[PDB]
Amino acid sequence: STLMKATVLMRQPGRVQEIVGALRKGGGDRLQVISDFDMTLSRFAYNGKRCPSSYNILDNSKIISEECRKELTALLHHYYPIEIDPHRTVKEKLPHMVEWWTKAHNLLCQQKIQKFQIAQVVRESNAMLREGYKTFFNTLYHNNIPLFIFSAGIGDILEEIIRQMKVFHPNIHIVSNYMDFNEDGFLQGFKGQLIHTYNKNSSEGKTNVILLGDSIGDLTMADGVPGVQNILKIGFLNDKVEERRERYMDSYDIVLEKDETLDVVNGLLQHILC
Ligand SMILES: Nc1nc(O)c2c(n1)[nH]c[n+]2Cc1ccc(F)c(F)c1
Ligand SMILES: [Mg+2]
C-alpha cells in the first residue's frame, strides 16, 4: 500500500517486492540506511521556489564576501561542465573534482569565518528538509538503525540543519567535509579526507541496505560496504523528469517523481521494522 502512492515508479515491481521481503525478514538488526543529503533529505522545492543546497546556504550568507562569492561562482562556471559531462569517465573527472573542491575549500579558509557563525547562517537560511523528516529520523533512531549521510558539501552546515530541526540523533553519521577551526574559533582548514561529488562512498552484520539519492551518481554510495546481501535503491526524481526518468527507473529500484516527502521511505521502514 505504501508503494501505491502516485509519485512511485518501479521498473520491476515484483523485484522490489522480493527485496522489501528480504529486508523485512532481516529486521532492523541487519539494516542500515545510506543517504545523500542535498535534494534527497533536504527538500527540492517549496512554495514555488527552489530550496537552497548546503553550498548555497553558506555561500549566500552574510559571512562570505561578495568577492568570494564571485570567485566561487567562477570556479563553478569552469568546473560544472566538466562535472556533468557524460563523455568524461568518472576516472577522468576525478582530478578536476579534487582541484575544484580544493580551490573552493581554500577560498573559504581565506575568509574570516568563525565557528559560532555557522549556526547563525543556518538559522537565517531558507534550509528545509523533506516533509516527513521527523518520522524518518525518529524511526531510525528509535529502531537503532544507523543512518550514513553522504555529502560533498560542508559537514558543519548539514549538522546544524538537522540539529536546528531537532532531529540530530546519535544514530546519524555524516560523511562529508568538516571545518577545522583555530583556538580563536576561525576557520583554518578542513578535516580528514576530501569528499567531492565523485567519491561519495565507503572510501558489523548490517548486510541489508536502503540507499536514498536524487542524482544518478548517488547509485554508488553503498559500493564498498562489505558483504551486502540485499540493497534497495530509492531515487528522488526532482526535475528534468522527461529527460531523466528512463535512466532513473532503469537503475533505482523505486523512483519517486516530484515527491517532496519521505512518506514512501517512511512507510517502507515501518513495514520492515514492524
Ligand atoms: N560552500 C562551498 N561552496 C562551494 O562552491 C564549494 C564548496 N563549499 N565545496 C566545494 N565547492 C565547489 C562546488 C562543488 C559542487 C557544487 F554543486 C557546487 F555548487 C560548488
Ligand atoms: Mg543530492
Numbering used by the authors: 6 to 208, 220 to 290
Task: Pull text from the paper.
However, one of the most preferred cN-IIIB substrates is m7GMP, for which the activity of dephosphorylation is characterized by one order of magnitude lower KM constant compared to the other preferred substrates, whereas kcat/KM is comparable. The crystal structure of cN-IIIB consists of two distinct domains: the globular core domain (residues 1–51, 132–182, and 215–300) and the smaller CAP domain (52–131 and 183–214). The core domain is a haloacid dehalogenase domain (HAD).
Compound 5d’ is a decomposition product of 3,4-diFBn7GMP readily formed under crystallization conditions. The crystal structure revealed that cN-IIIB binds 5d’ using the same hydrophobic moieties as in the case of 5d; however, the aromatic rings of 5d’ are reversely oriented compared to 5d. For 5d’, the guanine ring is accommodated in the hydrophobic cavity, where it is stabilized by hydrogen bonds between N1 and N2 and carboxylate group of Asp64. The guanine moiety participates in additional water-mediated interactions with a side chain of His 100 and backbone carbonyl of Ala157. The 3,4-difluorobenzyl moiety stacks in centered-parallel orientation between Trp105 and Tyr60, while the guanine ring is in edge-to-face stacking contact with Tyr60. The first one with tetrahedral shape belonged to the phosphate group, while an extensive analysis of the shape of second electron density revealed the structure of D-ribulose, which is likely formed during decomposition of 5d.
